[PDB]
C-alpha cells in the first residue's frame with residue numbers, strides 16, 4: 141500500500157522530472173532493451189535503431205501514463221483502467237518484464253535526480269512503480 | 282481477482298483434500314525443500330529430511346491457514362491479518378519463495394487428486410495461491 | 423544445474439512411460455489455460471475462448487506434440503542442454519519473438535502434468551530431478567537470446 | 569554471463585573511479601531501506617529503526633564495505649566468477665543461511681547507487697555491462713547452494 145508519505149515523495153520527485161518525463165521514459169526503454177534484451181521480444185514490429193523515433197514516441201506514452209498515475213495516486217486502479225484492459229487483453233506482456241522496466245525507470249531517475257533520489261524517495265518510487273505494474277497486470281486472468 | 286468459478290473450484294478441490302490437508306501441506310514443503318534448496322535457508326533450525334516432525338507440524342499450520350483463507354475467500358486480507366503481520370515483521374521470507382511453495386502445493390494436489398485437478402481447477406488454484414501469497418507479502422513495506 | 427546419476431536414471435525411467443504426444447498437447451494446453459496471456463503467440467490457432475476450447479484445439483494439440491518432441495529428444499543430452507537447444511533458442515528469439523519466461527512457465531506446467539498423470543509415482547525426489555531438467559531446458563532455450 | 573572485451577573494458581574503467589567504501593555503505597544501506605525485510609539478517613547491527621539510522625549505521629557501513637570489497641576482487645575473475653565465489657557461496661548457504669535472491673536485490677540497488685553517483689556518465693551501455701556483472705556475481709554466489 142502506498143503510504144501518505146510515499147505519495148508525497150512520488151509527487152515531488154515526478155514534479156521535479158516535469159516535462160523531461162517523455163525523455164526519461166525513452167531513456168528507460170533504451171536502458172531496458174540493452175540491459176535486458178529479452179524485453180525486445182515485445183517490440184519486433186518496432187524500429188529499434190539507435191535514437192529510434194518510434195522508441196521515443198513509445199517513451200512518451202509510457203511517461204504520460206505514469207504522469208497520470210501520479211496525478212491520481214489515490215485512485216490508480218480507476219485511472220489506469222483502460223490501459224489495464226489493453227495490457228490484459230492485447231499486449232499480454234509477461235508480468236516479469238514490468239520489474240525490468242521499473243528498475244530501468246529507477247536507474248534513469250537516479251541518474252537525473254542527484255538531489256531528490258534519497259533512500260526514502262528511492263523506496264517510495266520503487267513501491268509506486270510496483271503498484272502501477274500490479275494494476276497493469278490485475279486483469280490478466 | 283478470483284472469479285465466481287474460481288471460488289467454486291477452490292472450495293470443491295480443497296474440500297476434497299479434506300482431512301488430508303495437513304499431510305499435503307507437509308508433502309508440499311518437502312517437495313519445495315528438495316526441488317528448490319534455497320528455500321531451506323529459512324529453516325536452519327528444522328530437521329528437513331523425510332519423516333520430520335517439524336515439517337509435519339509446519340505443514341499442518343500452512344494447511345490450516347489455507348483452509349481459513351478458503352472459508353473467508355472474499356475477505357482474505359482481514360482473515361489472514363495476523364499471519365501477514367508475522368510474515369512482514371518477523372519471518373520476512375523473500376516474496377520469490379511464495380511462488381515456489383505455491384507450485385509445490387499444486388504438484389501435491391495434482392498427485393493426489395486425479396479426478397479433481399482439471400485444467401480449469403488448476404488455473405483457479407494457481408490464482409488462489411497467488412492471492413494468498415499477495416496477502417502474506419502485502420505489509421512488507 | 424546438474425543431476426546425480428540416480429536422478430538421471432529416475433528421469434529416464436519415468437520418461438519411458440510417457441506418451442510424449444499426449445503429454446505435449448496436455449502441457450501446452452494447460453499453459454494457455456492457466457496463463458492465458460501466453461495465447462498471444464497463437465492467434466492463428468483459432469478458438470481459445472474456454473478451457474475445453476483450448477485443450478481440445480487441434481492446432482494446440484499438434485503444436486504440443488512438436489514442442490514436447492523436441493523436449494524429449496533433449497533428454498538424451500542432459501550434459502549439453504545449451505548446445506542441444508542452441509538453434510531452437512536462436513529461432514525463438516530471432517523469428518518467433520518468444521519471451522523466454524514462457525519456457526519457465528511451460529516447464530512448471532509440465533511438472534504438474536507429470537504429477538497428475540503418475541500420482542504417487544511422481545515422488546518428491548523424482549520431482550526434484552525433473553525440476554532440474556525443466557530449469558535446464560528453459561535456461562538453454564534462453565541462452566542465445568540477444 | 570560472458571562479457572565482451574568492450575564491456576570488460578568499460579566495467580574496469582568505471583570501477584577505477586569508484587569509492588568502494590562509500591558505494592558499499594550506500595548499497596547495503598539502501599537494500600535495508602528499500603527492501604526492509606532484508607534487515608532479518610542484521611539484528612546484531614543495532615539500530616535500523618529509520619532510513620537515516622540505517623544509512624548512518626557504522627556496522628551497516630562497515631559490512632557494506634566488506635561485501636563490496638569481495639565484489640571488487642571478483643572483477644579480476646570475470647571469466648570465472650563461479651570459481652572465485654565458490655567459497656563464499658558455500659558460506660552464505662551453510663553458515664549464514666542467506667536466500668540468494670538477496671544477492672539479486674543488492675545487485676540492482678548497487679546499479680541504482682552507481683547511476684545516482686555517476687549521473688549521465690552511467691550510460692545505457694555502461695549499465696548493461698554492469699547488469700551482466702551483478703547477475704554474474706549473484707549467480708556465482710548462488711551456484712554452490714544445496
Ligand code: HNI
Nearest residue numbers: 179182183201202205206223226231233237238241272273
Ligand atoms: C517489456 C514490455 C512492456 C512493458 C514492461 C510495459 C509496461 C508499461 C508500463 C509500466 C509502468 C506503462 C505505464 C506502459 C504504458 C503503455 N504501454 Ni507498455 N509495456 C511494454 C510493452 C508495450 C508494447 C509492446 C506496447 C504496444 C506498443 C505499440 O505501439 O505497438 C505497449 C503499449 C503501451 C501504451 C500505449 C497504449 C495505447 O496505445 O493505447 C502505454 C500507455 N507497451 N507500459
Ligand code: HNI
Nearest residue numbers: 320323324339342343346347364372374378379382413414
Ligand atoms: C520458503 C519459506 C516460506 C514460505 C514460502 C511460506 C509461505 C506460507 C504460506 C503460503 C501460502 C502460508 C499459508 C504460510 C503459513 C504459515 N507459515 Ni510460512 N512460509 C515460509 C516460511 C515459514 C517459516 C520459516 C515459518 C516459521 C516456522 C517455525 O516453526 O519457525 C513459517 C510459519 C508459518 C505459520 C505459523 C504461524 C504462527 O506460528 O503463528 C503459518 C500459519 N513460515 N506460510
Ligand code: HNI
Nearest residue numbers: 460463464488489490492493510518520524525528559563
Ligand atoms: C508460449 C510460447 C512458446 C513456448 C513456451 C515454447 C516452448 C518450446 C519448447 C520448450 C520446452 C520447445 C522445445 C519448443 C520447440 C519448438 N517450438 Ni516453441 N514455444 C513457444 C512458441 C512457439 C511458436 C509460436 C512457434 C511457431 C508456431 C507456428 O505457428 O508455426 C514455435 C515453434 C517451435 C518449434 C518448430 C520450429 C520451426 O517451426 O522451425 C519447435 C521444435 N514455438 N518450443
Ligand code: HNI
Nearest residue numbers: 606609610631634635636638639656664666670671674705
Ligand atoms: C541480505 C543479506 C546479504 C547479502 C545481499 C550479501 C551479499 C554479499 C555479496 C554480493 C555481491 C558479497 C560479495 C558478500 C560477501 C561477504 N559476505 Ni555477505 N551478504 C549478505 C549477508 C551476509 C551476512 C549476514 C554476513 C555475516 C555478517 C557478519 O559479518 O557477521 C555476510 C558476510 C560476508 C563476508 C564475510 C565473510 C567472512 O567473514 O569470512 C563476505 C566477504 N554476508 N556478501
